[PDB]
Short mmCIF file of C-alpha atoms in Angstrom, two decimals:
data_model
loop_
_atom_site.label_atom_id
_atom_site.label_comp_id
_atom_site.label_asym_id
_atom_site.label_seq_id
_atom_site.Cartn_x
_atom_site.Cartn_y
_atom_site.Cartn_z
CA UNK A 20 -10.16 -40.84 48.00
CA UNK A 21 -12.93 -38.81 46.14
CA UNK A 22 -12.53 -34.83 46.49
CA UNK A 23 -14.70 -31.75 45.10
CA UNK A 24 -12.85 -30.52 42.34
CA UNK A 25 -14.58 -26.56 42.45
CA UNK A 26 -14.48 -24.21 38.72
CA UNK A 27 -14.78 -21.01 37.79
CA UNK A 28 -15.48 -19.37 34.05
CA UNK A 29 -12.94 -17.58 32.78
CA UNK A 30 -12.55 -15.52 29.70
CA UNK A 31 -8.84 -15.81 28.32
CA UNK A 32 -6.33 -15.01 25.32
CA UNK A 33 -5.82 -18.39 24.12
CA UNK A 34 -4.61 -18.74 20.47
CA UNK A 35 -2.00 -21.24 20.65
CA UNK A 36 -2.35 -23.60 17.27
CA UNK A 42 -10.55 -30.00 8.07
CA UNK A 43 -13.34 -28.77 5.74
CA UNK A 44 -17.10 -28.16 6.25
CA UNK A 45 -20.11 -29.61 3.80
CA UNK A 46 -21.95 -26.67 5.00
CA UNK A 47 -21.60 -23.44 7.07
CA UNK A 48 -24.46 -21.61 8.89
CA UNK A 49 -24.39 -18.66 10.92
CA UNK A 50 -27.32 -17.71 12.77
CA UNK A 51 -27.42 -13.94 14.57
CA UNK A 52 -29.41 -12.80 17.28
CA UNK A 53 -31.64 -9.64 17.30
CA UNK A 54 -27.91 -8.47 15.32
CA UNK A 55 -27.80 -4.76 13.17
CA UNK A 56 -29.76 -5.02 9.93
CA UNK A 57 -26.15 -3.79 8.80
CA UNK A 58 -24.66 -6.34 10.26
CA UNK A 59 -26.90 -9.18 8.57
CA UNK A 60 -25.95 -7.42 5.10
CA UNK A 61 -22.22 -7.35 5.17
CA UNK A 62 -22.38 -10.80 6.35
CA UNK A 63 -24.50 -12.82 3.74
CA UNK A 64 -22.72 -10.74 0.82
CA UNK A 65 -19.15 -11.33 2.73
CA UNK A 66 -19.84 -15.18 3.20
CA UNK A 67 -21.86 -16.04 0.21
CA UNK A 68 -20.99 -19.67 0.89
CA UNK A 69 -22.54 -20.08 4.46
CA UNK A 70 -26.24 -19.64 5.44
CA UNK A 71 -27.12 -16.58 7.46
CA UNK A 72 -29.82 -16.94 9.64
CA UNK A 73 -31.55 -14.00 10.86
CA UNK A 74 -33.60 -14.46 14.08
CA UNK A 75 -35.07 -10.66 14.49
CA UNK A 76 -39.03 -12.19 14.87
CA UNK A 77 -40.30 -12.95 18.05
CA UNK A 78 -42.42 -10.35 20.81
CA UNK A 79 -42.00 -10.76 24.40
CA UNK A 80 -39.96 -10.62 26.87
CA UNK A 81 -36.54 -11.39 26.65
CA UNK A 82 -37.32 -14.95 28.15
CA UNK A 83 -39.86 -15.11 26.04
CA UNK A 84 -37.78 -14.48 22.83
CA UNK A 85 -35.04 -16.79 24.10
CA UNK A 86 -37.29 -19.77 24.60
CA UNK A 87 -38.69 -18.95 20.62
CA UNK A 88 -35.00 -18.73 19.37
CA UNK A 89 -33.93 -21.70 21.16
CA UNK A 90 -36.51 -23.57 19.59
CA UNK A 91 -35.76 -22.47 15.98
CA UNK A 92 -32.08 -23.58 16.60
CA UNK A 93 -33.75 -26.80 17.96
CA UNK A 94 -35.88 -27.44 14.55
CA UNK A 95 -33.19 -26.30 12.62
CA UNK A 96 -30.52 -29.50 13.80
CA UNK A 97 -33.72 -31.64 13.30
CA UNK A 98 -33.92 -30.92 9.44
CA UNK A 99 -29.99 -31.00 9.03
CA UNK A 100 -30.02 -34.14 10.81
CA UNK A 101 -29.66 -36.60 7.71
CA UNK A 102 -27.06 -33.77 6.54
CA UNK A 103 -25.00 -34.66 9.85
CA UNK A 104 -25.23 -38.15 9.34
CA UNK A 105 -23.59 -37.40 5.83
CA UNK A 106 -20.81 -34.59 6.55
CA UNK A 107 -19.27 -31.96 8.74
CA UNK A 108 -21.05 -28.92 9.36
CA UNK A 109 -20.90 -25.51 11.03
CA UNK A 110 -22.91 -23.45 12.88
CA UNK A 111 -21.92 -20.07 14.82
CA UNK A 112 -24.38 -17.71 16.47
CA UNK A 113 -23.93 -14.42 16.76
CA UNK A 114 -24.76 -12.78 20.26
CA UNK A 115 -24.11 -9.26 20.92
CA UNK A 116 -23.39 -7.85 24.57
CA UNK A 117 -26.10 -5.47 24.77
CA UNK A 118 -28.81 -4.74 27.29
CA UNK A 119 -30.39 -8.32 27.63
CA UNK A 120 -29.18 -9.72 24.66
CA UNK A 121 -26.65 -11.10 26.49
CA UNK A 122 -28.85 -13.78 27.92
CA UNK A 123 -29.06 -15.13 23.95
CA UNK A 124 -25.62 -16.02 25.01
CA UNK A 125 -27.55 -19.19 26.66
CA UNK A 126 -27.41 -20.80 23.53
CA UNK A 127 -24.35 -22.30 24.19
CA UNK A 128 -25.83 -25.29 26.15
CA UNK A 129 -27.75 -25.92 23.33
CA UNK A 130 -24.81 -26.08 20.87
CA UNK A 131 -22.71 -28.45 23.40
CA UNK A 132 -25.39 -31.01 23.72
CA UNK A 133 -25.89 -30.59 19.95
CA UNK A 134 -22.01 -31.53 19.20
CA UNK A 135 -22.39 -34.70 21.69
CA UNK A 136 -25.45 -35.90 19.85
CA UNK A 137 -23.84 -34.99 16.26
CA UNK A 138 -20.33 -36.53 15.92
CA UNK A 139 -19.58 -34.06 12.71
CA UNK A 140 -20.87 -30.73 14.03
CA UNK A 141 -19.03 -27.89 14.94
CA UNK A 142 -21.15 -25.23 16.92
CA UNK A 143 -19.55 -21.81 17.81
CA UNK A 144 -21.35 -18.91 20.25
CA UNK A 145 -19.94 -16.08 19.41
CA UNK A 146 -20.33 -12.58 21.31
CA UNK A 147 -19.64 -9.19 19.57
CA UNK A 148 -19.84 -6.08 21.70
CA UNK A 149 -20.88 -4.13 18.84
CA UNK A 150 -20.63 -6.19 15.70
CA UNK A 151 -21.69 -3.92 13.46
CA UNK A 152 -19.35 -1.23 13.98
CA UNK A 153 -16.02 -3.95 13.20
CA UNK A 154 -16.07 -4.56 9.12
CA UNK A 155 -13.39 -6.79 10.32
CA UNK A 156 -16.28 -9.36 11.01
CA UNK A 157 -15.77 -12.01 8.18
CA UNK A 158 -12.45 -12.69 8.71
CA UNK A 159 -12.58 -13.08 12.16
CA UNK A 160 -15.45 -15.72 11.76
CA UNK A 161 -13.25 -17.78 8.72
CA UNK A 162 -10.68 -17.78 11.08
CA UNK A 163 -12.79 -19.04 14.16
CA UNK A 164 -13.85 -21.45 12.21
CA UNK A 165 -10.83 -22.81 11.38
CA UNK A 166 -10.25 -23.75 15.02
CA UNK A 167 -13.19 -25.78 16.23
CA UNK A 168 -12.03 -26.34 19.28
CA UNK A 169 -13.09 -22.96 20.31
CA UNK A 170 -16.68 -23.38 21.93
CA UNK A 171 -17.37 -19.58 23.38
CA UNK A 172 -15.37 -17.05 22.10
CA UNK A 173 -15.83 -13.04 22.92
CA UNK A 174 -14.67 -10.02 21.25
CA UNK A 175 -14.98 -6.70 23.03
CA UNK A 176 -12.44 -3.55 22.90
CA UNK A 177 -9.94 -5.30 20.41
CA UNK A 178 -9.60 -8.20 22.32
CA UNK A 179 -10.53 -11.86 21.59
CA UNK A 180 -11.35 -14.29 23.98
CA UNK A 181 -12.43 -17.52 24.65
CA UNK A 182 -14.06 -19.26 27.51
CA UNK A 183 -12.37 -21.72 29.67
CA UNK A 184 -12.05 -22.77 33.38
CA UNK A 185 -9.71 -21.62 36.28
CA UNK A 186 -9.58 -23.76 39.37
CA UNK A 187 -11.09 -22.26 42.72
CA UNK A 188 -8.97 -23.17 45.85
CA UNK A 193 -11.65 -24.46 57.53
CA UNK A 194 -15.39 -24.32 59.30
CA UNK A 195 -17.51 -21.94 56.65
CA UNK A 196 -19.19 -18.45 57.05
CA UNK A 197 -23.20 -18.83 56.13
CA UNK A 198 -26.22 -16.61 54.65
CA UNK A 199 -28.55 -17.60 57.26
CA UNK A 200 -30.71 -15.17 59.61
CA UNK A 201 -32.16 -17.08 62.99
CA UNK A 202 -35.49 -15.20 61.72
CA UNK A 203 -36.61 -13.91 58.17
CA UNK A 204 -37.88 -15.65 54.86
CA UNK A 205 -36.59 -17.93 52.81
CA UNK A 206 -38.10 -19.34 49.23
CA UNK A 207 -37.11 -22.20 47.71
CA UNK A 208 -38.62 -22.47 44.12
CA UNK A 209 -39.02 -26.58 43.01
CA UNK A 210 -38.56 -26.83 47.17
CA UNK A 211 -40.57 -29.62 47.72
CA UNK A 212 -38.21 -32.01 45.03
CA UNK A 213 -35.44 -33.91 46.87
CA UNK A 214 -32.93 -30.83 46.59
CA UNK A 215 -34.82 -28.38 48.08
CA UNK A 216 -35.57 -30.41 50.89
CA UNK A 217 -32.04 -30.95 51.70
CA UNK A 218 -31.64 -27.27 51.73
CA UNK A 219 -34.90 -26.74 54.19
CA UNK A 220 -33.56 -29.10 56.22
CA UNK A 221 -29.83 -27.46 56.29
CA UNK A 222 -31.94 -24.00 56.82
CA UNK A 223 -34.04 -25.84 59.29
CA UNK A 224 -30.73 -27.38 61.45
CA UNK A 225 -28.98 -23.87 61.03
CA UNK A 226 -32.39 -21.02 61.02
CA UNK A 227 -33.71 -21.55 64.66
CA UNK A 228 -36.88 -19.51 64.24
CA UNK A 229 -36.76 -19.27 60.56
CA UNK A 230 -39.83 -19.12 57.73
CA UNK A 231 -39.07 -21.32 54.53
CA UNK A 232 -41.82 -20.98 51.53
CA UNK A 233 -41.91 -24.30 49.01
CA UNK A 234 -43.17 -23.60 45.98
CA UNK A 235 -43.89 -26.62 43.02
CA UNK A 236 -47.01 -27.65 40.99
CA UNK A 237 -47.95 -30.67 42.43
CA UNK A 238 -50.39 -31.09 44.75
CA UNK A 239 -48.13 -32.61 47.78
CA UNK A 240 -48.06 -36.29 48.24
CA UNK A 241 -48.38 -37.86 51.89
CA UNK A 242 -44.67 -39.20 52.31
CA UNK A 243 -43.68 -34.70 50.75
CA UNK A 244 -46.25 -33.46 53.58
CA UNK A 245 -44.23 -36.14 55.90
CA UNK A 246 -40.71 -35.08 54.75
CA UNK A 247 -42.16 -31.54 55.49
CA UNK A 248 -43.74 -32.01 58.77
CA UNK A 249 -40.16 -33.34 60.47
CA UNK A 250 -39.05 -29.84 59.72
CA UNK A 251 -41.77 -28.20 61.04
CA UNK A 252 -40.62 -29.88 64.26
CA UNK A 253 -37.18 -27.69 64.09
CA UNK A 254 -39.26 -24.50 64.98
CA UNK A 255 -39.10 -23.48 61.78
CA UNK A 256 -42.06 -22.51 59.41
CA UNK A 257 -42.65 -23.98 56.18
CA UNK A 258 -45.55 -23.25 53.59
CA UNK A 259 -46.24 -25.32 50.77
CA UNK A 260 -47.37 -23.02 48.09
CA UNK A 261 -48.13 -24.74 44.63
CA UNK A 262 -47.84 -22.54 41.89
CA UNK A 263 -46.25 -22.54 39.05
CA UNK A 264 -43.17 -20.12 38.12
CA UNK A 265 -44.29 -20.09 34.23
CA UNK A 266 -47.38 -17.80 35.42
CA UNK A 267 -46.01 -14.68 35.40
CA UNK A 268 -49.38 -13.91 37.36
CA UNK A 269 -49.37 -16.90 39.93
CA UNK A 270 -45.65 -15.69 40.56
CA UNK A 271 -46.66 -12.42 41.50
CA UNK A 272 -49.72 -13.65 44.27
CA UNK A 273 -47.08 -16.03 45.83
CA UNK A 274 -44.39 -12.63 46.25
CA UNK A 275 -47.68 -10.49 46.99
CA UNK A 276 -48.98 -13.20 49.82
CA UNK A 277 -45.01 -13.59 50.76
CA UNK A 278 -45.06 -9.80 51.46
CA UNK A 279 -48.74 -9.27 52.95
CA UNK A 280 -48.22 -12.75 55.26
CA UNK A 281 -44.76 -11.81 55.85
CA UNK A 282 -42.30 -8.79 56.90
CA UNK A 283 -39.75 -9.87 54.07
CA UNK A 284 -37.88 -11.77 51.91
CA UNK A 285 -34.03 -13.04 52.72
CA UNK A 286 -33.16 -15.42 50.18
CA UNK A 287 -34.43 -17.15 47.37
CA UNK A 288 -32.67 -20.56 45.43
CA UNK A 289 -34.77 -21.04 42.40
CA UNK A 290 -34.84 -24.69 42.04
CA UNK A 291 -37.53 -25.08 39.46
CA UNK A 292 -37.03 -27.41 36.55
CA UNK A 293 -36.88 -30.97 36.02
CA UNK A 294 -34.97 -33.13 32.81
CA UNK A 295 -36.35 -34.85 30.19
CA UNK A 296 -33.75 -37.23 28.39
CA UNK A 297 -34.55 -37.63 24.65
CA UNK A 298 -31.90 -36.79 21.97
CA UNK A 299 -32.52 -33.78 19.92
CA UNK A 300 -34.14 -36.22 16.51
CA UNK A 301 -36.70 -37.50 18.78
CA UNK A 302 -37.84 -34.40 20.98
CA UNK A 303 -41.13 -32.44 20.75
CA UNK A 304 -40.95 -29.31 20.39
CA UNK A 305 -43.72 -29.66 23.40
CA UNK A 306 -41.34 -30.95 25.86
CA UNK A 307 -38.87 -28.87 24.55
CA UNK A 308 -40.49 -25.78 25.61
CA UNK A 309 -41.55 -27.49 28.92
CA UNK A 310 -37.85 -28.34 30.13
CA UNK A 311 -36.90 -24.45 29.39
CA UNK A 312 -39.84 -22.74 30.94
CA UNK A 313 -39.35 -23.02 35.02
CA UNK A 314 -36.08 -22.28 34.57
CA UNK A 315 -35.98 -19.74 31.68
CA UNK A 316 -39.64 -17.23 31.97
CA UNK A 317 -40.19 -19.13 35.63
CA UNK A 318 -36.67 -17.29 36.24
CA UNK A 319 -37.51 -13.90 35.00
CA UNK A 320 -40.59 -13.75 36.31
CA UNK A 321 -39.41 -14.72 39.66
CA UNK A 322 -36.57 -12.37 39.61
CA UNK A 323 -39.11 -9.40 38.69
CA UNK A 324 -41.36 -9.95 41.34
CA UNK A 325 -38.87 -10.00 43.65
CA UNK A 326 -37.06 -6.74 42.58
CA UNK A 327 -38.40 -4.53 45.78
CA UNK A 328 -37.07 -6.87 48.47
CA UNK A 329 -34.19 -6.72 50.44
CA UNK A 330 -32.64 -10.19 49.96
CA UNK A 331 -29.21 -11.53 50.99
CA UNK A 332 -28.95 -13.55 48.10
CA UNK A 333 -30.48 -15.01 45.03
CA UNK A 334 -29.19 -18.23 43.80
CA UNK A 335 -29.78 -20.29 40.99
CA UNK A 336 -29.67 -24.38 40.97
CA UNK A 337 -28.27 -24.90 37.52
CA UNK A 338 -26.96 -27.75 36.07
CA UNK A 339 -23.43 -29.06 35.17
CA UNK A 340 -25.16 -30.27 31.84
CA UNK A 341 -25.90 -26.29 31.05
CA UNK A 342 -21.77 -25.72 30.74
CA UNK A 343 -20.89 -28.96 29.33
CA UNK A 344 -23.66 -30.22 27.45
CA UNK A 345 -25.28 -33.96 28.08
CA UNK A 346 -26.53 -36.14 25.51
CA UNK A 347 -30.61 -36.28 25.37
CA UNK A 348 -30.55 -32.97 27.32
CA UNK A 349 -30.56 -30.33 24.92
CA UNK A 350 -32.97 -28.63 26.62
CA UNK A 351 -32.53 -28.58 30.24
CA UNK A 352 -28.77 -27.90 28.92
CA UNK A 353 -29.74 -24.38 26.91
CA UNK A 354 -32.33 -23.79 30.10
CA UNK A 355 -29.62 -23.93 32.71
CA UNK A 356 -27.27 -21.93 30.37
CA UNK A 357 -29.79 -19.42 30.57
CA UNK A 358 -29.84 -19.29 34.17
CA UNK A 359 -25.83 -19.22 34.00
CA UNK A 360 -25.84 -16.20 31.78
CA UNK A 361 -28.89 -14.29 34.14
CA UNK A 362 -26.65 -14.42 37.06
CA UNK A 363 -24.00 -11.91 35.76
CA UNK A 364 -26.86 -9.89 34.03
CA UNK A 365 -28.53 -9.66 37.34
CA UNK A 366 -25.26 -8.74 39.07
CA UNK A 367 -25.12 -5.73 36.56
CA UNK A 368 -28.95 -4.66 37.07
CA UNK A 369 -27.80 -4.65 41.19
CA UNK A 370 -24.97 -2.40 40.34
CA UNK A 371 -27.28 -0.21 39.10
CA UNK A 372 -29.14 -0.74 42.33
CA UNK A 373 -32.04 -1.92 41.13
CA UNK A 374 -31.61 -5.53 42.18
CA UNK A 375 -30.86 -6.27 45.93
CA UNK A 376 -28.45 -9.30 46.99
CA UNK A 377 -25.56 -11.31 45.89
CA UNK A 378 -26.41 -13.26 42.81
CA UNK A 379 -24.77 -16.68 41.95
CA UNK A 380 -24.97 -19.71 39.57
CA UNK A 381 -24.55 -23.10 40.71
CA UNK A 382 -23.68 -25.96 38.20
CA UNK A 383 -24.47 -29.30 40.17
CA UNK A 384 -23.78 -32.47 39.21
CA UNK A 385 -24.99 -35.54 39.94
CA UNK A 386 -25.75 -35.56 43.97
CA UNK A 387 -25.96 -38.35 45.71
CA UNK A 388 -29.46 -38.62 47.24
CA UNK A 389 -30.67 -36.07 44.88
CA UNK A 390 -34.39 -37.55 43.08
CA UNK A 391 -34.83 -36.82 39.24
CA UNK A 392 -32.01 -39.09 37.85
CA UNK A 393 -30.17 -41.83 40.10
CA UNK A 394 -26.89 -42.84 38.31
CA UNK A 395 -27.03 -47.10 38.93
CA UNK A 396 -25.48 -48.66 35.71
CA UNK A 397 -24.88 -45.03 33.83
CA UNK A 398 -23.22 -44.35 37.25
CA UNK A 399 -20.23 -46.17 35.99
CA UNK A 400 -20.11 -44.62 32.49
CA UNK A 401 -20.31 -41.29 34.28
CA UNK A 402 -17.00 -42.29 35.71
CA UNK A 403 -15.82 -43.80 33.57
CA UNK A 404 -16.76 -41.15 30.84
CA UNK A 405 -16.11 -37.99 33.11
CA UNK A 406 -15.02 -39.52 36.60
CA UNK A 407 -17.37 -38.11 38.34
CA UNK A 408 -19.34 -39.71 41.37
CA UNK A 409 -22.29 -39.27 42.85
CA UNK A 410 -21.69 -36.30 44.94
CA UNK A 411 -22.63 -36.50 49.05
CA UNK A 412 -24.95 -34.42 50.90
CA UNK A 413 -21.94 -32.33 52.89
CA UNK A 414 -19.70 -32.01 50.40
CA UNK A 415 -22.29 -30.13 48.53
CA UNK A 416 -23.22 -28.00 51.42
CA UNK A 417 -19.90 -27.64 52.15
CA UNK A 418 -19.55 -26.32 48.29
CA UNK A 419 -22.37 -24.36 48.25
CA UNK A 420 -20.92 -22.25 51.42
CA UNK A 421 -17.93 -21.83 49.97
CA UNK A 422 -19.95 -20.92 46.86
CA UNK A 423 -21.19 -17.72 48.60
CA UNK A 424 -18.17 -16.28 50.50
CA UNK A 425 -16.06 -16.47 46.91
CA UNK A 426 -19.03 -14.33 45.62
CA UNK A 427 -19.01 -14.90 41.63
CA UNK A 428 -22.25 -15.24 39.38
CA UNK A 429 -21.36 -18.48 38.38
CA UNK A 430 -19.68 -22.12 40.28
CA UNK A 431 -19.28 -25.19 38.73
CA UNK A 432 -19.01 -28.28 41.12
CA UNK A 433 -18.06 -31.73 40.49
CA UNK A 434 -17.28 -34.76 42.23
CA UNK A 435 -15.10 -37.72 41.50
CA UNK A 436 -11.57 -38.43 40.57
CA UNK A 437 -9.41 -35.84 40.40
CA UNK A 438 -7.20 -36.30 37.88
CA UNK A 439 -9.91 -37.51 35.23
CA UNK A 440 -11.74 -34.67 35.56
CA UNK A 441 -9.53 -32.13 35.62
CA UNK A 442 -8.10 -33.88 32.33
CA UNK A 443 -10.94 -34.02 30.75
CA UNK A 444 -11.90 -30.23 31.45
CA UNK A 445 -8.67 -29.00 32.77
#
């Protein structure tokens, strides 16, 4: 009576159909042109102008996240008071694209604030349109509009189109397998699949933790499949500790055939009470841990490279700004990494996952919220098979990005269509 309801992004023409205390527009690495016209063309909005931080481009997203973090602190009484909006700026553009990530921050931001309306806008080449201010008045005049895109004349806006017998798998019998976070509950579930499916097959675990009895227990069960696993305890944030753990992969091994990055863990507080601390420590396995992973990992040939996001990344989840703008990150690498391969200088099919809730799944366990969750979004608790039997089908549809959900139908697709 419960069936996988299965998304995929979209980018349509949808144009179909009150007033603002304050407006604030905040653009990202934009043209110092750009900035100008703005402020002097919308005199009665704040312009932010993030242009500051050095480092990679994880490394600047984390910083700008974190400034549009401590920037809804400060308004905060302002919400309380009145309506407010906020648009950022993202230009397509090399890796700016990834800025685009910000949109999991501004969903969780509009469930926390009743009164806020937060837009992510992307501009091929702003710049170059003096159209710009109208376009933006006239976005914000329909707040419904979450992501919108303009590129070659066109404006878009981002939506979801529905996705629709015994599946085709990624597996080789031998060859290497990583699973980043692979010792949490998740990537356990996925050594064992591997283990039931590999035959002779090599699966790397990675986490920080020194491993606990009951983990090395877990582990040693699927050591008895044949296959070999190799706990090795390092953290993704160390750009350095990232690049021994490829290094030893390569030295100790012949390759590398697949890699899930599941590192990254939730931390529910809502955005008034956060530290900036914990902040930062929700986005970094996911967001630097990500790059850093992904560039280490350039030279090998894999099969695939996918991503364990989070349906909280696309929708946004109250107390979960964070782990929201992290996995919206991870979201928005998949397509740039598609692009780098098409280049050729990535190998393997790259995709996105947005989970929900599953069902014997550790970090959160759903109990009393369970029934809110369905009764706010209808979703359930999703079961081991069903998930493996959506991740497969994840892989032969080959797109960068798959949102899954479980529960009721009809509620969900109403609430989402």
């Amino acid at each position: 009576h419960m069936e996988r309801l299965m998304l995929e992004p979209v980018w349509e023409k949808q144009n179909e159909e009150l007033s603002y205390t304050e407006h604030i527009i905040v653009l990202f690495e934009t043209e110092r042109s750009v900035t100008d016209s703005i402020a002097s063309h919308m005199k009665d909005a704040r312009v932010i102008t993030l242009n500051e931080a050095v480092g990679h481009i994880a490394e600047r997203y984390q910083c700008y996240m974190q400034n549009i973090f401590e920037l809804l602190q400060s308004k905060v009484r302002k919400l309380s008071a009145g309506r407010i909006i906020i648009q950022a700026i993202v230009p397509l553009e090399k890796e700016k694209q990834l800025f685009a990530g910000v949109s999991g921050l501004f969903k969780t931001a509009e469930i926390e604030f009743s009164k806020l309306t937060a837009q992510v806008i992307e501009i091929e080449k702003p710049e170059e349109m003096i159209d710009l201010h109208l376009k933006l008045k006239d976005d914000s005049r329909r707040p419904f509009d979450k992501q919108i895109r303009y590129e070659a004349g066109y404006r878009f806006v981002k939506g979801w189109r529905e996705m629709v017998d015994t599946l085709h798998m990624p597996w080789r019998d031998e060859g290497v397998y990583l699973i980043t976070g692979g010792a949490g509950s998740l990537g356990l579930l996925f050594a064992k699949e591997i283990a039931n499916r590999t035959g002779r097959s090599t699966i790397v675990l990675t986490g920080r933790s020194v491993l606990s009895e009951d983990k090395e227990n877990e582990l040693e069960a699927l050591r008895s499949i044949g296959a070999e696993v190799v706990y090795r305890e390092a953290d993704v944030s160390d750009q350095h500790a990232v690049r021994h753990l490829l290094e030893e992969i390569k030295e100790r091994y012949g390759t590398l055939n697949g890699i899930i990055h599941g590192a990254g863990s939730s931390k529910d507080r809502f955005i008034i009470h956060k530290t900036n601390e914990e902040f930062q420590e929700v986005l970094q396995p996911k967001v630097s841990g990500l790059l850093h992973v992904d560039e280490c990992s350039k030279d090998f040939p894999l099969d695939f490279f996918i991503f364990f996001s989070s349906v909280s990344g696309c929708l946004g989840n109250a107390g979960q700004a964070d782990y929201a703008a992290a996995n919206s990150f991870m979201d928005a690498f998949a397509e740039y990494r598609r692009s780098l391969a098409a280049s050729k200088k990535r190998f393997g099919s790259t995709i996105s996952f947005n989970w929900p809730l599953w069902e014997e799944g550790g970090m959160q366990v759903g109990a009393e919220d369970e029934k809110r969750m369905l009764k706010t979004t209808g979703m359930v608790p999703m079961p081991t098979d069903s998930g493996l039997k959506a991740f497969y089908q994840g892989i032969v549809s080959d797109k960068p990005q798959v949102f899954v959900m479980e529960g009721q139908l009809q509620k969900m697709k109403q609430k989402l269509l």
